[PDB]
Homo-oligomer: 299 residues x 3
């Protein structure tokens, strides 16, 4: 008799998380009067100030943005900003009385093989899928990086895109992002540490400002010094203006040893334009320290 | 050393449930002699009288219906009836000696996030998939309702369609129904409480008879009385014949307060044609009680 | 507070298994100098001698085969042999110092419903998916058998094809094989006992040599003797040459009672060509013992 027994379930993560996952409506005004729904999507309430993360593609060209909570409350939202490269956008609502927020543990380290649920709220019940973390993502902002997504075999679709990816404790692991283009059975999410970083940037600047040094190049035992060889230098770029030349060997950027081309470019992307930084190079078996003014990455 | 350890497994649910999941063969007689297989599918033994649920689309246009059990027994089946809207059909076999039956717990409440296995028997080994309950279904019979399906990311395919969806205890959560048309990675099943209701109806009437009041309309703090405003009234329908008019406010149907358009229409669908029921409306700030004879929903 | 709690995870199986799952590169030499990558895939280190299993379709037409380990080591591989029917190939590398190997428990019985992870290493992080065993496979080598694959709803794709399928203990359940052609949501792997058998055969003969008796036919209470009726006999085949005729009833092959057409054909496939075996038949209610020289299955 199974009357006595308890079914295997992830319902606990759902109870803790789902209340913070909202419906997001993109509404157009036809010139008739009338209000019609252009598209629908999911979003996640990040804190008690009423900031919400959703997908950019859900809110593009909205005349009015409406947010609906599982508890019945309906709000008009303000668009704070968005980013095409990560397909994220931030909204703000003004709420009296408390808001449910997504559980976030900043100390939690995501592990490959961890169980995850992808929680949507397309029509408001909710659409929820289960899978594991297939690959952890990087949290870099360099525009050319392909590795800044968490991968999962939990199904990511129009139902749950823009909603929350959580572990079995209901802690946020990422923001679901539908792929418009990769292996069958693999979906993607923005890692939660990258998503909060992007939110903070949108809140202060209204957009994600990426740093640029204008250099292409590739990496060269412990007794050999690692570095990045300069393959090409962008005309009228920061490096070119500072006197950096092809075949230079970059051993240091802004006081950080340059041992990896990928790490150093994510490093530069975080540096605010107008910043003046030292870059140490090896040329003709001599050390040169050059002063470089960072610019904004070209569109 | 893993010699000592025990692999994570749902094999227990399989052992309890799978013996009641059968092969169903649709066989045509070409005029040659010969017996050929038109299509194959899964079915579920519901009780010891030998009643079986399968998909209608598996048994359509069968000259002969054959059922095969995991234990080797082969039976000829009688078609009791079917329903296009839920794609269910009921069969009956005459068996001497016991039959294996699907475990059913009528006290069990399905929860979103519960683990489920979708069990098929396409060729007789079996084809089994794993997922969770994404959304619980309604058990309504109103023909226009879209919400009467349980949703799951367990894979539902030609292998397991018509078979059993069970939790990790082997208890029946639904009947697998392949979608012929929704978000990628989502399949559907008839919730088990709706499936048993449909079976009981087919057994007594040979078809699912749905009640009809012939009314379109939408719902209007606790101090305000909820109701359904009548948008349109069907000509020569039950409501029209009873004297119900547009802009009437329906506050009560068959002694049940009408607070939701969806609940009241599922309510009417369960009422047998020929039934005479009271319907209370508000017209011109006055209460009117009208006597309505329910009819059968038009095809 | 979830700070104290532990997320549900299969990370243990990943830690035990993943280090033995390698990147396999198929490289062509264009006549320029240059070395270019024709295709990429996964492979599994089977033992400390440096034998590796991958897919045949990954190494077809390679000018050079390169293997890369999660720990950073890169090797040139020798192709030992392959088999089209199972899409397996074996490689060998020469390594100084230890190699990580896949955990194998030959005593472990795979069960339907067991949790499995499909581990790939397409670019070297790794691509990992989760599912269950849907159906256990046969380990037969008869070329016409359709049942020699393990089935799983763990996603099998270009990422993880040729890599390892393991249970939650990290024990090898099979080798992932991408299907180029079956129900949606079902993938396939070579059962691990069949995969090791194929590897041993490739190592001694350089190819999989299958036995052939040249007979078509089908099986006829315990008091009735089971047998295989001969439907057809191949001209100039082993059976024809030995004097076996249509309507003969095969009751014994190589001293094994013939109670199943499927079992007896897998039995014959394992017998080495040139072998002379007894085959007992019933003809005209008399027993005849015939001496048959096994041949190699025609391409």
């Amino acid at each position: 008799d199974s009357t006595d027994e308890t079914p295997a379930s992830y319902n606990l993560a759902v109870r803790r998380a789902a209340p913070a996952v909202v419906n997001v409506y993109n509404r157009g005004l036809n010139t008739n009067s009338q209000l019609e729904i252009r598209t629908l999507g999911s979003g996640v309430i990040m804190d008690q100030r009423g900031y919400i993360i959703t997908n950019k593609h859900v809110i593009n060209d909205a005349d009015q943005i409406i947010v609906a909570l599982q508890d019945g409350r309906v709000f008009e939202a303000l668009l704070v900003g968005s980013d095409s490269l990560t397909d994220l956008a931030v909204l703000k609502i003004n709420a009296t009385g408390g808001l449910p927020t997504i559980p976030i543990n900043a100390r939690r380290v995501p592990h490959i093989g961890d169980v995850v649920l992808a929680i949507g709220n397309p029509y408001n019940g909710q659409t929820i899928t289960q899978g594991i973390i297939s690959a952890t993502g990087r949290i870099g902002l360099n525009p050319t990086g392909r590795q800044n997504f968490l991968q999962t075999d939990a199904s990511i679709n129009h139902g749950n895109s823009g909603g929350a990816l959580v572990n079995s404790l209901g802690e946020l692991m990422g923001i679901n992002t539908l792929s418009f283009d990769t292996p069958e059975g693999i979906g993607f999410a923005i890692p939660f540490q990258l998503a909060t970083k992007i939110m903070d940037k949108l809140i202060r600047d209204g957009r994600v400002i990426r740093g640029y040094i204008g250099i292409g190049g590739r990496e060269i035992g412990i007794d050999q010094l690692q570095g990045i060889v300069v393959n090409e230098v962008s005309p009228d770029g920061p490096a070119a203006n500072a006197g950096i030349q092809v075949n230079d060997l970059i051993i240091s950027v802004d006081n950080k040893p340059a041992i990896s081309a990928l790490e150093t470019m994510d490093q530069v992307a975080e540096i605010r334009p107008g910043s003046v930084i030292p870059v140490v190079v090896m040329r003709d078996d001599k050390q040169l320290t050059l002063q470089v003014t960072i610019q904004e990455y070209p569109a």
